[PDB]
Ligand binder design. Structure first.
Ligand SMILES: CCCCCCCC/C=C/CCCCCCCC(=O)O[C@H](COC(=O)CCCCCCCCCCCCCCC)COP(=O)([O-])O[C@@H]1[C@H](O)[C@H](O)[C@@H](O)[C@H](O)[C@H]1O
Ligand SMILES: CCCCCCCC/C=C/CCCCCCCC(=O)O[C@H](COC(=O)CCCCCCCCCCCCCCC)COP(=O)([O-])O[C@@H]1[C@H](O)[C@H](O)[C@@H](O)[C@H](O)[C@H]1O
Ligand SMILES: [Fe+3]
Ligand SMILES: [Fe+3]
Lengths: 309, 309
């Protein structure tokens, strides 16, 4: 089945994509195209991939882009997690230690959420008779415990059905999405509802491929974070909730030590009144430690096309 | 920049995509995913590809699928031509010689065209005052010159502006697309207009990438063919027209010896009348030789998602 060797493949890729160039070329794009196309041709030779199989692959990728699921596919195949493994190794090689650990952004961030200082209520109350109330609170500090005032804490999470606003058009714009600036004591408080885990769209392209791989498409319950402050490295992270069936079996491999929180139960009448609530609730503490920016530090910001509203 | 070696990459890909499998797996899909993902991770290590670059790559692929241009990108990068180079080498290894040579289908075939016996007029006459008339004719035979009656000759080509019907909604359905069954003398005749070459959609995703590579996105004038008959190997081919600026500089690399025809000029009054025309015209002869199907022959049919109307 080997019709071309790697020398012959490299020569053909060069003839088609490099020899044909006239004038200014983007050298990085040229480098990446030449590498990936040569690698594709070699895998076609090694696995004897048939034309019908190549076309099915391209039709799948077309359908995935049309469904806006390529970000989801990157999470599910573990490419998104792999980028984090690389970033962690680059930071170790720089001697960066400390800081709350990073994990994946996922494909569902939306820019433009309501901003407030110290406190936000994240939900619109439309599920109040069908989901538990959750209070999240924490302090943002540097690596020696000094508070950081005015840190931007951005949080987003799913509703009682595992659905996110903006993507789920039945929810109000920005439901369960807020930006909270830490107060004079480095504190943020979010009044919200308990998120549930969820799967991929069952009839979508990501689940179709996972099915062929014998894999589920479920994530455990979590709340996403971006945390940033002047003079500090931006953080992309989450917390997970102890007790979830999928805690250590996330189809996107995002759970890590340091990021699992326990939801405590508050049933005490006095404490409930003090919080201005009328029913028992769940409470999570999630403190965040930020690493100070250094001249030597690799960038911790990621340019990525994100929804906005 | 090397944060993982290939052993470590292979172990991670296996942990994420193979160890997680429960129940029935499609073994071929699993094999291809594991190979391509390991190759991607290795190229990310070797070229130190940054997260922002990965996201830009995925956003490009998303936009390309949304524009329905991934078939066009496969032609332009030379992947489609590479599949033909492989098919030619498999046929040589089988001892298949003879036959009109194959070349690429391209992404613009549409199933359901008008069918007729021996003769078809391909155009609707809407360009008759702005393009030259072309008559194409030929005989379909086996490799020793014996005629084949009832062979299905499917032809499609661009208008005077380089545009194809179905894709260009200004044209009538199936304009310049016909199926002609060879007559009792193995003959087909098509009355049509001269095709012009064309470029990629200038504001589209394929041209955007070609621009970064310093490359043009133009094809020389051509007419596409599928030819099939009971007992014979299906053929995907075209002819090109001598004289085209881009004849040997097709951005999809489709031109080959054996497939370039010369358009002759017919100005003779008697011949024009005999054809029932009123002006000079162009004439192309394109005979087709088909190879008989053998038990040993590799399949020459390609399953691919194609438009229909
Ligand atoms: C880059 C590779 C270039 C391509 C060039 C190489 C590609 C080669 C792949 C060939 C695979 C073997 C084919 C076996 C025969 C197919 C039979 C079949 O059941 O058809 C289909 C099988 O074909 C595939 O889906 C394979 C896609 C894998 C490619 C992406 C993984 C690469 C990893 C990393 C690269 C970076 C990629 C980035 C990662 C983020 C069935 O379909 P589907 O359920 O998976 O999706 C289904 C489906 O196909 C339905 O038709 C659709 O309607 C539905 O919505 C969809 O969900
Ligand atoms: C498979 C790989 C998985 C991905 C994972 C690996 C991907 C890594 C690629 C990184 C490349 C280096 C990035 C450099 C910095 C980017 C700056 C920039 O100008 O941004 C963009 C550069 O990014 C790219 O386009 C690279 C895409 C190459 C991937 C496909 C080739 C792989 C070959 C074979 C694989 C099989 C693939 C199948 C082949 C058929 C500019 O955009 P654009 O003009 O090319 O398209 C533009 C554009 O981007 C506009 O934003 C859009 O609006 C417009 O419509 C579009 O035309
Ligand atoms: Fe999420
Ligand atoms: Fe064409």
């Amino acid at each position: 089945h080997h019709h071309h060797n790697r020398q012959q493949i490299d020569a053909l890729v060069k003839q088609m994509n490099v020899d044909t160039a006239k004038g200014p070329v983007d050298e990085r794009i040229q480098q990446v195209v030449v590498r990936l196309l040569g690698d594709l041709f070699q895998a076609i030779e090694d696995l004897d991939i048939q034309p019908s199989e190549v076309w099915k692959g391209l039709e799948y990728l077309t359908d995935a882009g049309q469904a806006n699921e390529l970000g989801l596919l990157a999470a599910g195949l573990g490419l998104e997690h792999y980028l984090d493994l690389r970033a962690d190794e680059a930071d170790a090689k720089a001697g960066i230690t400390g800081g709350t650990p990073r994990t994946i952004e996922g494909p569902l961030y939306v820019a433009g959420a309501p901003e407030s200082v110290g406190f936000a209520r994240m939900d619109d109350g439309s599920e109040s008779d069908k989901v538990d109330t959750l209070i999240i609170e924490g302090t943002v500090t540097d690596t020696e415990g000094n508070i950081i005032e005015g840190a931007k804490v951005e949080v987003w999470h799913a509703n009682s059905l595992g659905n996110y606003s903006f993507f789920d058009k039945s929810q109000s714009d920005f439901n369960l999405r807020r930006t909270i600036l830490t107060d004079v004591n480095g504190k943020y408080v979010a009044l919200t509802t308990m998120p549930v885990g969820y799967g991929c769209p069952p009839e979508g392209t990501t689940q179709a491929l996972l099915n062929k791989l014998g894999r589920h498409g479920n994530r455990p319950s979590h709340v996403h974070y971006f945390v940033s402050a002047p003079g500090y490295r931006k953080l992309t992270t989450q917390f997970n909730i102890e007790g979830d069936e999928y805690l250590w079996d996330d189809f996107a491999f995002a759970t890590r030590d340091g990021l699992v929180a326990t939801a405590t139960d508050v049933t005490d009448e006095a404490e409930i009144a003090r919080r201005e609530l009328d029913k028992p609730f769940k409470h999570i503490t999630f403190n965040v430690e930020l690493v100070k920016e250094a001249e030597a530090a690799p960038s911790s910001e990621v340019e990525r096309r994100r929804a906005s509203a």
